[PDB]
Amino acid sequence: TDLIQRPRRLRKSPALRAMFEETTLSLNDLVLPIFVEEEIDDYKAVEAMPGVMRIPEKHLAREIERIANAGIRSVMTFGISHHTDETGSDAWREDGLVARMSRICKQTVPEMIVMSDTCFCEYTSHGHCGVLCEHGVDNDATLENLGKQAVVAAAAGADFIAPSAAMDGQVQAIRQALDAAGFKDTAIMSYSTKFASSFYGPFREAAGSALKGDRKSYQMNPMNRREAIRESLLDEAQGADCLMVKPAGAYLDIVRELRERTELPIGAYQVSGEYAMIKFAALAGAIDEEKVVLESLGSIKRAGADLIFSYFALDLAEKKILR
Amino acid sequence: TDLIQRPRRLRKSPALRAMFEETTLSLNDLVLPIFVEEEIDDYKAVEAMPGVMRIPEKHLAREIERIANAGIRSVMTFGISHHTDETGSDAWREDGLVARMSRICKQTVPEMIVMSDTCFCEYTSHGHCGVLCEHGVDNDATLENLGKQAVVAAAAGADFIAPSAAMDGQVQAIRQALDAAGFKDTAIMSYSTKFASSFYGPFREAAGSALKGDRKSYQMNPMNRREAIRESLLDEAQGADCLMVKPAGAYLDIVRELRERTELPIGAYQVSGEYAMIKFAALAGAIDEEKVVLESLGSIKRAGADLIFSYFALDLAEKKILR
Amino acid sequence: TDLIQRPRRLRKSPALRAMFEETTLSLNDLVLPIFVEEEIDDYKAVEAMPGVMRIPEKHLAREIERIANAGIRSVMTFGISHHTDETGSDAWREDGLVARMSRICKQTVPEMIVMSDTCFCEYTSHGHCGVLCEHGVDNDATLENLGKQAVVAAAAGADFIAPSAAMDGQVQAIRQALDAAGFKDTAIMSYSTKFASSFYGPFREAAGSALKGDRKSYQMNPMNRREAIRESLLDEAQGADCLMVKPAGAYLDIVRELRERTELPIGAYQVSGEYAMIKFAALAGAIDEEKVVLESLGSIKRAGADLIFSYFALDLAEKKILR
Amino acid sequence: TDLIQRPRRLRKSPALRAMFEETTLSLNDLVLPIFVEEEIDDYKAVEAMPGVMRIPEKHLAREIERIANAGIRSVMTFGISHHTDETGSDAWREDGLVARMSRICKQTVPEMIVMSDTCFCEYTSHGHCGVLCEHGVDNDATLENLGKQAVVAAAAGADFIAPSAAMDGQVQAIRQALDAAGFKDTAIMSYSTKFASSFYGPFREAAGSALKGDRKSYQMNPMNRREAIRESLLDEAQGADCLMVKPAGAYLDIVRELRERTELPIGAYQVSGEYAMIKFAALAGAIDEEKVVLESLGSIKRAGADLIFSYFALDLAEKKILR
Amino acid sequence: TDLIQRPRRLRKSPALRAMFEETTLSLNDLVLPIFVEEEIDDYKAVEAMPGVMRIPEKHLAREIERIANAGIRSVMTFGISHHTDETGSDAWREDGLVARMSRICKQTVPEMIVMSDTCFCEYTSHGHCGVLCEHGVDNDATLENLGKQAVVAAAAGADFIAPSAAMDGQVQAIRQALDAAGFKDTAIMSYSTKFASSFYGPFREAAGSALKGDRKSYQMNPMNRREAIRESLLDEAQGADCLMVKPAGAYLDIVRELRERTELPIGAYQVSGEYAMIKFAALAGAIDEEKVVLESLGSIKRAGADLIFSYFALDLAEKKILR
Amino acid sequence: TDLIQRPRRLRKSPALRAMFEETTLSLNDLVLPIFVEEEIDDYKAVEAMPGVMRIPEKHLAREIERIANAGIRSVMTFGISHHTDETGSDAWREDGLVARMSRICKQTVPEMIVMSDTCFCEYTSHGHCGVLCEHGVDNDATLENLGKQAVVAAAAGADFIAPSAAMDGQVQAIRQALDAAGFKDTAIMSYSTKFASSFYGPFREAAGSALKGDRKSYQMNPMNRREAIRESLLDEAQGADCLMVKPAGAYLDIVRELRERTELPIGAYQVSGEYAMIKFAALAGAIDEEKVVLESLGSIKRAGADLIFSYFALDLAEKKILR
Ligand SMILES: *[C@H](CCC(=O)O)CC[C@@H](*)CCC(=O)O
Ligand SMILES: *[C@H](CCC(=O)O)CC[C@@H](*)CCC(=O)O
Ligand SMILES: *[C@H](CCC(=O)O)CC[C@@H](*)CCC(=O)O
Ligand SMILES: *[C@H](CCC(=O)O)CC[C@H](*)CCC(=O)O
Ligand SMILES: *[C@H](CCC(=O)O)CC[C@H](*)CCC(=O)O
Ligand SMILES: *[C@H](CCC(=O)O)CC[C@H](*)CCC(=O)O
Ligand SMILES: [Mg+2]
Ligand SMILES: [Mg+2]
Ligand SMILES: [Mg+2]
Ligand SMILES: [Mg+2]
Ligand SMILES: [Mg+2]
Ligand SMILES: [Mg+2]
Ligand SMILES: [Zn+2]
Ligand SMILES: [Zn+2]
Ligand SMILES: [Zn+2]
Ligand SMILES: [Zn+2]
Ligand SMILES: [Zn+2]
Ligand SMILES: [Zn+2]
């Protein structure tokens, strides 16, 4: 045949493929989500997320040291509340679970970058991400509370306040609140593009969010690509230090489009449902877990993500699979 | 607070979200991959693909009628061979499994759009997609054979010849051979950007591909986004009627980038590993299968895919979930 | 003051800066240029390149093993000739220095990616990169000879034929000659954009190029950015597998502009003058050598280079500074 | 051979190359950095920067007249302090070294465009670019001081206040301060994109900055190209009259990307380490200093810089190498 | 008022404006059009072009020496014919005026870059730029003759063959004829975008073009900007070494649009009508000639022209106004 | 010859050329500049602008009726002052020449769109466009006065206030001033991109501006294309209703670049020097005035101008050359 162009020439050997690989994945690209349950004794297994367990608050010092020894540079904290109410007020109490998870992490490992999930669905009796109303989740009532929670977590040592409530103006609210309390240097990792996904079931079981309905009046429609970009750019305008796309696995088109529309770092969340789909397919012997995990995380990097939130990070770190 | 812009305004009710949904998915967007096994009597369950089964050649006429009655408009045929050899020559036999699958489908439902998968990994003793040589898979020898296969599948009635061998210049070779044989109107559905993915294990089980090594010397590197675009644009230059990204699920950044680089239709293959990942977490109770399938297929459409190859297509049709 | 945007927030600690670093450099990005001198016994120090030495052909098998063991994946071969003449014909001798360098490397480390520098300035009595004529360097006569050289270097095992003669149509000539001789799978690493730079003095000393005038009638003008892009895009049109910008150091605007104009891999040559500039200020105590080398190579990667030709590569490998 | 396109046609002679040269370099493109040491008698040689010497304040009138007679249109002043303290308060004293270097230059040569380096690393006991804190260099404490120093240098006659502290909001601070003191016409040359480079060693020896640690908590990461663009555009937003990339030699990709993102003039700093690398390689006889200097400065122009800060400017001017 | 942005800041002095000037004009940018009349003894003044005169062929050797000594690097030759006929055949006579003008210039100043105007309007009895037929000017018959003219001007030493006949495919015809005759290195300066302008009256007077009608059936419509770009891009596709916009003065939007659509060098012809307009208002005392000429030529450079054909070039050179 | 593409096909006849002409010029595209001298009796001829005469204020009613009867839709007024002082205060007197020229025009012809030139160079003793200072023309002292003049001309009936002072923030100043006085509906035609051209000599003689020096500290440098765009976009930001490029003839590249950077209407001024160059070349019989005038104005339209200020408009209108 007559072909000047033969893409296969650079695919002949492992060495050639290595030399021409366009995207790299390292441990530094990973942020590890940790679930911490207050007022409890033993680690609790999360059924829907094989390998994942609620860390007892009294064992957090031990765990964050373990995580840090594995090479993990960062964690995103999620608390399981034993003090849920109507407005999730435990979250903004100077000594509530939110403040303490941060405090225990920063005090045990000063160099650990601690990102504090910032919401109310794990602390409200109804399970919704804010103050409920005859209306639904009240946007501006919630903004006030997010700002209050932001200040106590910032005071507790959190490096990033990561608003995941999907409230309009959330970044501005929190930016205004941190600044006024003297936390002008505390960064905001905004879950800027957060879809009303059906992939969060395993996470709600693990973080114990008591929601019976859905989050469609605040988390955005999965189908809306132009809206997804607008969501994140409104947060860049508001001062966010880092932007994010969640879920990440089935939204790589969003990640890539966003990368082309901002100079800001972009995080991407490999959600619980993705973790779950890989784990159960591997358990059924249908796929090779490690190859599938590396290809998955690699694609997220390829699409333009600077940071990836992944429940596989520790195992990848300890088993020296990523360095 | 004072916010003029409130994305949440159009999220208040199901009616508002329906009005403002940017992407829609119909039954028409789906192409159904079918496994046909010659010389057998009972349908065989594919263990790695819960719900999928090999159709006995003797029952193909009944199954294609069933699919057509469900409202499925197109299928992609894959055969399980009982006559494999070194070069997979049964594939270009005027009456081999490949020609017969097309013949039966088109004779049974003349309006059925039949896409014939065009390779050899299912017909070779070594399980590689072409002629093995001291070299590895010999590109040009395989081009010769792919052309011969093309003419007999077209001769049997295939509407599209779909090369999945990942050989350079495969679209040009198939186009010349078809035109020369008087099949200038037969279309080419090129598996233009086809990654050396770790997500095809379930498929190889279902199709009986006898491969011990890998396809890394022809299928392309998962990490190479620039190369991915170049792979499809080369096929556009050689005459493909339709391009394709495979896998789809973890490659929607690629689908989006390609959509913006061509005016040609783009197919996306929701591969066996993606199907198994959904099926197995649904069976373990971790996710809602239907919600996850529709969100996954919807994402593929949102990223820019015009057609989606999906194993869930017949259930979606029969359960009237998509019309 | 009141600033919402504070770039300094992600600069506070080594961990934060590591997380947000946009570019990374690995050992894999580097290609090692090697000088091999036939008919000699002792390694010769190149005075202008502190630390570099000509490898005796008799010791090449030992040095290529040493480089391969350091983890270097690829080399670019340069010979010092003891059999120079008017047309540099030893370069296309089935058993000349050029063929032998490749033969030895590939025989010794089969997995070594061997790029054979393809020119004549090291084999001609006049030191010009081709056939001298009343005219100057005769483009088309040199094209003929470059093709012949290509086939014998491919015949000896070179993985890439790297034309550095700066002759028009050199990639097309080399591609036709290779294909015709049955080397359709041999790749071309074109020195596509190669400037008539004043930074090659150390290299000419090390390679023994016997040139009294300059190369301004073939190598291109350092000031011509539009022409630079056009030079590489022409080579893309002629089939090059990889393009290149040489020198790299003072031409990262060119690397960036080319990166945005092609999907092809781009190499960048950190030339001898750049190496000498770093080596000599490091020896005078003016800078920290290691910090400067890594920042320089990192910049080349940041600008868009996929591969970097660098004389510092073996020290970087052995001192485990890059992996 | 058959080539319609022959790039070499316009390279045949010096006249042709001259006619088609795309980029030009003149003396007007150069700004000369001068080091002035107070309370001293003799010129002090800078070991790390051969040819460069600290000018005794009492000899500044003589030197700026010499510089101006050579054709140099502009200088950037750097003072060596004999009055260093905790906050570098000498810099904002109406008669401190900063104010006097400007005053002596503008009064001796009224047409000389004087740019005043605006920072504190040459005036602080610790050597850091601002007010130190338990925290590190205090951003907003430093902004106040930069504004105060800006007003006295502006009052002393400086044409450009050139903030090189790498503090967020620095341009706004200084713009606000000059305006309020009635210096609304005084321009700001912002070191808008200033990297935490390893190429400043020779400069710190010459300007005597007493820093033991590093500037990584304020000067930006060398590897971050998207961040580099954002840095400069934030300064355009803040009112800067001219933008700048420093270092310039190994950041030509940054210079070019920035040129494409703003209508503003862009300066580029050929730093001390670059000056040093060229001087020591030339001293070792490895390169031709003049050819290498002109090619270096030419590339900076080629990449998009309107002005170039260069320690070679005077010699280039006196030796009538550039006009 | 409160304005952060004050463009006036960099306009305060001649030194500041010199520093920030974005475009420069040198003697090197200019090409001098020369009129040579065979069989005459005295230089003839062109009334419509104050200052321009026809050079007697007998004095051409003296004038080309004069131009070369002024520092002019290139000329465009135009002959006044005493041997005109129906097809302008003296133009392709091995020893006709066209060949002789080149011969004399190149023999006298070998380094002179000689561009030979390539047409027939100066050699035909009817004054049209080619072969007249029942049809009008016959495109393909004129292509034949333009090729023959090309080879004899190249044979005489012309560095560039400049077709100004406005015939379709003229660059391809001239390129084939040159290559075939062994002139593969002769360049083509195509008058690629050449408008059917009303500004050539002075030129026709000076060149003696005997035309009674117009050139509207070959030269293009002044109003057609899309067509203008298409005209030059077609010549790029046919191999031109350099493109051109003629006239220049009232077409700088075209120059700018073309600059952004090609990487090729672009010439711009400051035509006779533009020269006469400047000369006559300068003579009537309405404008300052020198200031207007430099501003006009500067504008042409600012718009993107690499070379400018200008009748003012020798005065500019001799009066040392441009170097 | 073999040419699929023949641009000449659509040039064969006047009908074809007419059908495919891309740009049109009509009378509606023209605004006519008128000079009105107060306290005088007879029309005064402008020597430098043949055909142009100062209209005696007492004859303005007659002239604007004549102009309006010719089909002219608009005029730009310029007054010749008999009451010049230090600040040009006649311009903001409720009954000064500025207010009266507008009043007489709008009252005689209510439908006439009257644009009022808004500056001080025709009313200041020194001839500069504003309040002089030890500094030069005081920007903000001038802004106050421009606002005051804007209000009286707006009150006098002017439809457009056209600031031609080249003061920073001029549009904002005037927008603020008109709004506060209740002239929120009065439009601003900003001479947004106004170069320090050498083409205004004839205009200064006609409008009698007493300037001995130059306007280079406020009108912008002719060579600065990026600055030219920034000038106009700052005015769009400030609220200008229409933008403008002056001069227009030699700045068609600017006009085209601006057209691509804004949705705003763009005016272009065919200045006095252009008018003068065409008139004197025509008088000398060197060019055809009408063909040259139509081609000139046509090019300005072609480049992107919506409106053209032209001294030829009335003659073009009366002679029914444009309709
Ligand atoms: C290409 C890849 C199959 C393989 O490599 O085995 C042709 C079939 C694509 C679908 C595979 C799947 O669904 O996993
Ligand atoms: C091209 C230029 C070499 C020369 O002109 O002598 C091939 C080698 C590139 C590397 C030269 C270096 O490292 O200086
Ligand atoms: C093309 C047009 C000449 C014509 O049509 O007479 C070749 C010469 C261009 C320069 C003409 C001028 O300077 O007016
Ligand atoms: C976003 C929404 C979670 C929810 O429960 O709605 C904040 C946490 C994201 C992680 C979800 C996951 O991993 O599935
Ligand atoms: C920027 C930072 C200098 C430093 O010492 O950190 C201000 C001066 C730039 C010149 C540095 C050089 O020339 O090396
Ligand atoms: C702009 C500047 C005129 C000046 O005299 O500086 C306002 C009027 C423009 C018309 C000038 C002309 O027609 O030459
Ligand atoms: Mg939001
Ligand atoms: Mg392919
Ligand atoms: Mg080339
Ligand atoms: Mg900054
Ligand atoms: Mg043409
Ligand atoms: Mg302005
Ligand atoms: Zn929540
Ligand atoms: Zn296959
Ligand atoms: Zn060479
Ligand atoms: Zn500093
Ligand atoms: Zn002609
Ligand atoms: Zn004025």
Coordinates of N, CA and C and ligand atoms in Angstrom, one line a residue, chain F residues 117-122 127-130 164-166 194 203 209 215 218-219, ligand 18:
Chain F
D117 N -18.1 69.5 16.2 CA -16.8 69.2 16.6 C -16.6 69.7 18.0
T118 N -16.0 68.9 18.9 CA -15.9 69.3 20.3 C -14.5 69.4 20.8
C119 N -13.9 70.6 20.7 CA -12.5 70.8 21.1 C -12.3 72.3 21.5
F120 N -11.0 72.7 21.5 CA -10.6 74.1 21.8 C -9.5 74.6 21.0
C121 N -8.9 73.8 20.1 CA -7.8 74.3 19.2 C -8.2 75.4 18.2
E122 N -9.5 75.6 18.0 CA -9.9 76.7 17.1 C -10.3 77.9 18.0
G127 N -3.5 77.7 20.3 CA -3.8 76.7 19.3 C -3.9 75.3 19.7
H128 N -3.6 75.0 21.0 CA -3.7 73.6 21.5 C -5.1 73.3 21.9
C129 N -5.4 71.9 21.8 CA -6.7 71.3 22.1 C -7.1 71.3 23.6
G130 N -6.8 72.4 24.3 CA -7.2 72.4 25.7 C -6.5 73.4 26.6
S164 N -12.9 65.8 19.8 CA -11.7 65.6 19.0 C -10.4 66.1 19.7
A165 N -10.5 66.3 21.0 CA -9.4 66.8 21.8 C -8.3 65.7 22.2
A166 N -8.6 64.5 22.0 CA -7.6 63.4 22.3 C -7.2 63.4 23.7
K194 N -7.5 58.8 17.1 CA -7.1 60.0 16.4 C -5.6 60.1 16.4
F203 N -6.4 71.5 6.9 CA -7.5 71.7 7.9 C -7.3 72.9 8.8
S209 N -6.6 77.1 13.2 CA -6.0 76.8 14.5 C -4.6 77.3 14.6
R215 N 0.8 68.1 18.3 CA -0.1 67.5 19.1 C 0.3 66.1 19.6
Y218 N -0.8 64.1 22.9 CA -2.2 63.7 23.1 C -2.8 62.9 21.9
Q219 N -2.6 63.3 20.7 CA -3.0 62.6 19.5 C -2.0 61.4 19.5
Ligands
ZN18 ZN -8.5 70.2 18.7

